[PDB]
Amino acid sequence: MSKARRWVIIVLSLAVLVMIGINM
Amino acid sequence: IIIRYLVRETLKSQLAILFILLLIFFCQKLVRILGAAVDGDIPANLVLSLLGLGVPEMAQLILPLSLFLGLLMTLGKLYTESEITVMHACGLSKAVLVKAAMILAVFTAIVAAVNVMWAGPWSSRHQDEVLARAELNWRITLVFTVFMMALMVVPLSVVNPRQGRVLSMLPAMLLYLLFFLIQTSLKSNDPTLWMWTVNLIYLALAIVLNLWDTVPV
Amino acid sequence: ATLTAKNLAKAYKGRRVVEDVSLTVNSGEIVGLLGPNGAGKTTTFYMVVGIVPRDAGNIIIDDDDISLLPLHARARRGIGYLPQEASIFRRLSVYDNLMAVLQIRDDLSAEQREDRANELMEEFHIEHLRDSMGQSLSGGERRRVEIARALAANPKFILLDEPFAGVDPISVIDIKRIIEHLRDSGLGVLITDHNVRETLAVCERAYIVSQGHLIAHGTPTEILQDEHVK
Amino acid sequence: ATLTAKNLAKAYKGRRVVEDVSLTVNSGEIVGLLGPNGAGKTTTFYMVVGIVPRDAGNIIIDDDDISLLPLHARARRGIGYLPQEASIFRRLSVYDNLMAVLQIRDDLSAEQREDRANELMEEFHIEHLRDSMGQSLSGGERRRVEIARALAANPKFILLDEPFAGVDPISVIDIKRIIEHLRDSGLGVLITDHNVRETLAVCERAYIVSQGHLIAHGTPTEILQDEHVK
Amino acid sequence: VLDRYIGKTIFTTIMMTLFMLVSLSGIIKFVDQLGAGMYTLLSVPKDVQIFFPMAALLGALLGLGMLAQRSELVVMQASGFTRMQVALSVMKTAIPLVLLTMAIGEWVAPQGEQMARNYRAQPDALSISGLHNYVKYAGRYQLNMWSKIFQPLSVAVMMLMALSFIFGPLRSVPMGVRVVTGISFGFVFYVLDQIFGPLTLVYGIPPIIGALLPSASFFLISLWLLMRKS
Numbered sequence: 005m006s007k008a009r010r011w012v013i014i015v016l017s018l019a020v021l022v023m024i025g026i027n028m
Numbered sequence: 029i030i031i032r033y034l035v036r037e038t039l040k041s042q043l044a045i046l047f048i049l050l051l052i053f054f055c056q057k058l059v060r061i062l063g064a065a066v067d068g069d070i071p072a073n074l075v076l077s078l079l080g081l082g083v084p085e086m087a088q089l090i091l092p093l094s095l096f097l098g099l100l101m102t103l104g105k106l107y108t109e110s111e112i113t114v115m116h117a118c119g120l121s122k123a124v125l126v127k128a129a130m131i132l133a134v135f136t137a138i139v140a141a142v143n144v145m146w147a148g149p150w151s152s153r154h155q156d157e158v159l160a161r162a163e164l165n166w167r168i169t170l171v172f173t174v175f176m177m178a179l180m181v182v183p184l185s186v187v188n189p190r191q192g193r194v195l196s197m198l199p200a201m202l203l204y205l206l207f208f209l210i211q212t213s214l215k216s217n218d219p220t221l222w223m224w225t226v227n228l229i230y231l232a233l234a235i236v237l238n239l240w241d242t243v244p245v
Numbered sequence: 246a247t248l249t250a251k252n253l254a255k256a257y258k259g260r261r262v263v264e265d266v267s268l269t270v271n272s273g274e275i276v277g278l279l280g281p282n283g284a285g286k287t288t289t290f291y292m293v294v295g296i297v298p299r300d301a302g303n304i305i306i307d308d309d310d311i312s313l314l315p316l317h318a319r320a321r322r323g324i325g326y327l328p329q330e331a332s333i334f335r336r337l338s339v340y341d342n343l344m345a346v347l348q349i350r351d352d353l354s355a356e357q358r359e360d361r362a363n364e365l366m367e368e369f370h371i372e373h374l375r376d377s378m379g380q381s382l383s384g385g386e387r388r389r390v391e392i393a394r395a396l397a398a399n400p401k402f403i404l405l406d407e408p409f410a411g412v413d414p415i416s417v418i419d420i421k422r423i424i425e426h427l428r429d430s431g432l433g434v435l436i437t438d439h440n441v442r443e444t445l446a447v448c449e450r451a452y453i454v455s456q457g458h459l460i461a462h463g464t465p466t467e468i469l470q471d472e473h474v475k
Numbered sequence: 476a477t478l479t480a481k482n483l484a485k486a487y488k489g490r491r492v493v494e495d496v497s498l499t500v501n502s503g504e505i506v507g508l509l510g511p512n513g514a515g516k517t518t519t520f521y522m523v524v525g526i527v528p529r530d531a532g533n534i535i536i537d538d539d540d541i542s543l544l545p546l547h548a549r550a551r552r553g554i555g556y557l558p559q560e561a562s563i564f565r566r567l568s569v570y571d572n573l574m575a576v577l578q579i580r581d582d583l584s585a586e587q588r589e590d591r592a593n594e595l596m597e598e599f600h601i602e603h604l605r606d607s608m609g610q611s612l613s614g615g616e617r618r619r620v621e622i623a624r625a626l627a628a629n630p631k632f633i634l635l636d637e638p639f640a641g642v643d644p645i646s647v648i649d650i651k652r653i654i655e656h657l658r659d660s661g662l663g664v665l666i667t668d669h670n671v672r673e674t675l676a677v678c679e680r681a682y683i684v685s686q687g688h689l690i691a692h693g694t695p696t697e698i699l700q701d702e703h704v705k
Numbered sequence: 706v707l708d709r710y711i712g713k714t715i716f717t718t719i720m721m722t723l724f725m726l727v728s729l730s731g732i733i734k735f736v737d738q739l740g741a742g743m744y745t746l747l748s749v750p751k752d753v754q755i756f757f758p759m760a761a762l763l764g765a766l767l768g769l770g771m772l773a774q775r776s777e778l779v780v781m782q783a784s785g786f787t788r789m790q791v792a793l794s795v796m797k798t799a800i801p802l803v804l805l806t807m808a809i810g811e812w813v814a815p816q817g818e819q820m821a822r823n824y825r826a827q828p829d830a831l832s833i834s835g836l837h838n839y840v841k842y843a844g845r846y847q848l849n850m851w852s853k854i855f856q857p858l859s860v861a862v863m864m865l866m867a868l869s870f871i872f873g874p875l876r877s878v879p880m881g882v883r884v885v886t887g888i889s890f891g892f893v894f895y896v897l898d899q900i901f902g903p904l905t906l907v908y909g910i911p912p913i914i915g916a917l918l919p920s921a922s923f924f925l926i927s928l929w930l931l932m933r934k935s
């Protein structure tokens with residue numbers, strides 16, 4: 005992996021995952 | 029020639045990911061004429077044009093997804109066989125991939141234009157009849173998406189082969205889903221057209237992430 | 246026309262792999278880069294053709310500091326890479342396959358571009374077939390075509406990555422005629438391998454990598470004589 | 476004390492790759508099985524073990540045709556096997572990994588579950604690692620435990636699969652000690668590998684196939700003469 | 706014991722693929738505000754009634770994949786076990802799991818779900834026991850009665866589905882497609898339990914076994930994969 009690749013797929017996925025709940 | 033090598037093959041897998049996607053969204057709508065007709069007062073034998081000519085509710089939403097994920101899947105096949113890096117280690121630069129992505133995007137952006145203006149009221153005014161400010165401005169930020177995700181997916185196609193293909197294409201499918209879901213929450217809401225910069229940030233990310241190795245520090 | 250690597254290095258996670266690497270090639274010599282596994286053959290060889298980023302050092306081609314330049318530019322200067330596994334274009338004609346190299350060859354005019362490829366199919370004995378999809382080729386007949394790709398971009402220094410990648414030894418002497426043929430046309434070639442019994446027959450001077458160091462500045466005759474080879 | 480697999484044939488969706496192959500091994504011999512890639516090296520060998528099922532012929536071990544019977548009772552019948560890559564259980568302790576096969580030894584008692592554990596642990600000089608995780612070994616140390624979890628099944632004829640497959644050649648002299656040690660106790664070892672000019676130093680019959688045909692066999696000194704083996 | 710190893714490996718992931726995935730659906734329940742209300746902290750096991758069996762595949766095939774494509778399942782294969790004996794081991798560790806989802810159907814989850822809507826002050830699921838002889842005058846509640854008796858049975862079928870096509874078609878594939886196939890047969894339970902309830906309620910003249918059919922069609926598939934190829 006990388007130092008950032010295991011840190012983008014956490015933050016950017018969390019911004020996807022909270023955003024589903026805005027229009028749920 | 030080498031541009032013809034891509035667009036005869038990504039379009040050979042554009043249509044294959046199209047029909048498996050046009051069929052997977054019938055079985056989330058044909059459920060809703062059986063799981064909702066007994067629950068929310070929708071009649072029975074009107075489905076033959078409700079599910080039949082109801083397709084521009086969904087075909088305005090999957091052509092930017094099928095052109096995106098069609099191109100992403102066929103570059104994942106093209107890196108992991110190391111056919112990119114005998115072509116990359118010849119004289120042609122990264123620009124052959126970017127020039128090819130616009131040409132295959134015209135064959136979708138024409139279809140996404142004819143659907144959104146001419147085949148829309150072919151159902152919205154000749155099939156919405158039964159036979160048995162609130163402006164939206166969402167049609168321009170959906171044609172502009174097609175010439176935009178194809179410009180940024182060609183630098184996000186690396187496969188780093190110690191990690192698999194599906195983990196490599198995770199920050200592309202997940203980044204498209206973030207863009208293509210703000211543009212519904214910012215359609216129902218009321219500072220409308222303030223979401224045009226949201227369209228412009230990921231266009232600036234489409235430029236920043238595309239050239240990130242040609243430049244010095 | 247001479248590569249000159251000087252003082253190459255690589256480090257990750259606080260751990261170091263490469264230090265004090267100063268290999269060179271010349272126009273007309275076959276240079277090995279053999280050694281044990283994981284101790285820095287691949288990391289040195291990917292440093293010369295920069296799929297991996299360089300941390301320290303410089304590589305030059307006739308006083309042209311091309312070290313920061315990625316694979317976009319080293320094709321324009323004389324470096325031609327050849328991958329390990331099957332790197333042919335997949336479903337496309339063999340005559341059409343050589344033409345895709347010859348698009349960005351703009352110093353050579355486009356009326357011998359359909360004519361040099363007619364000549365270039367001759368010498369590697371591939372002109373038996375001219376229209377064939379890349380599916381229906383075998384691991385020996387295809388090997389004469391992947392070399393023909395990077396040869397068509399007119400480099401100075403072809404760079405091979407394990408051409409002895411587990412084939413039958415009657416095809417070793419098939420590849421050995423090709424390497425002795427593309428050293429005649431002024432092309433220097435660096436080569437890595439693990440088949441060290443067959444690398445030391447095609448060579449003029451080799452090197453070695455044992456966790457960073459260089460213990461093999463000289464000829465294959467100095468290998469059966471030297472003590473620190475274990 | 477002798478297996479024989481007569482008339483082995485196999486097709487892949489109406490396409491023959493192996494057809495009418497036969498070989499005889501005894502107890503106390505090392506028998507090679509070589510050839511060109513993709514022509515009957517593996518597909519003959521993996522059908523003796525039983526990863527792929529047969530299409531004809533009969534695999535016989537001491538007048539007992541086991542051809543309908545897959546791998547899930549051949550190790551109980553007396554055929555050992557170990558893969559090409561790392562196959563330590565890599566989550567379990569070594570002493571627990573060593574008696575892992577010893578639990579399915581249902582003709583034995585509970586105090587003998589320490590007997591064939593502790594005899595076989597100190598046999599390969601690796602008894603100083605009774606408590607060790609699986610991912611705490613090296614390439615010249617992983618292989619010595621992996622052999623030890625094949626004698627514990629009590630087989631008659633063990634079948635290796637290219638052991639020296641990526642080690643430096645000044646380390647294959649110690650693998651050949653392990654091969655001779657298994658050859659010392661009388662259990663036959665049938666190996667297949669691609670580097671032909673390395674396994675001929677330790678072999679005794681060395682069958683050679685090509686295109687799904689038996690071509691030449693016998694002994695290594697009486698096999699370097701034929702025109703068909705080139 | 707290595708029967709306490711496969712069972713430990715499955716139970717390592719079947720909690721780990723659950724706690725990651727329930728809390729993924731826990732953090733998506735910040736929709737009611739659209740601030741001190743722990744409504745999602747209080748209705749955690751209400752999802753685990755239904756959000757569990759699609760994790761009983763993704764996780765019994767995720768974690769068993771890294772037990773199989775590390776070249777380990779074909780060692781226990783070749784060291785005495787049968788294909789049935791490894792199938793008995795996941796059922797040795799399915800019975801601490803079908804009982805664990807049986808417990809939340811009566812004791813844990815509707816007790817808090819009773820006070821779920823009550824705590825946020827400013828299919829009528831009650832239990833298995835209390836819902837038994839609640840529907841004495843039938844209907845839709847008779848279906849979701851009979852759906853809830855052997856909804857925990859589907860977890861034992863699920864680990865037999867996960868073990869079904871790990872021996873058949875899907876074994877020589879990379880780890881990425883084991884999640885996509887491991888989720889597309891898990892996503893399809895949404896589009897199967899939410900139609901064949903109202904199918905049998907409207908059209909099905911056997912109105913009782915309309916819920917048995919989703920946990921029946923994933924048993925015909927499992928008996929086809931391990932009884933046709935070999």
Ligand SMILES: CCCCCCCCCCCCCCCCCC(=O)O[C@@H](COC(=O)CCCCCCCCCCCCCCC)COP(=O)(O)OC[C@H](O)CO
Nearest residue numbers: 005006007008009012015016019183184186188199233237
């Ligand atoms: C609110 C959300 C709106 C947009 C959110 C954007 C968030 C980040 C923007 C997009 C970043 C992900 C795009 C692809 C990531 C990496 C792809 C890539 O080109 O390769 C590397 C690119 O490197 C990175 O992933 C790091 C990029 C950003 C680093 C951290 C983010 C900085 C963002 C600044 C502000 C962020 C504010 C919110 C954060 C989301 C990553 O892998 P690697 O470096 O291990 O291997 C390839 C090698 O680098 C080739 O050169």
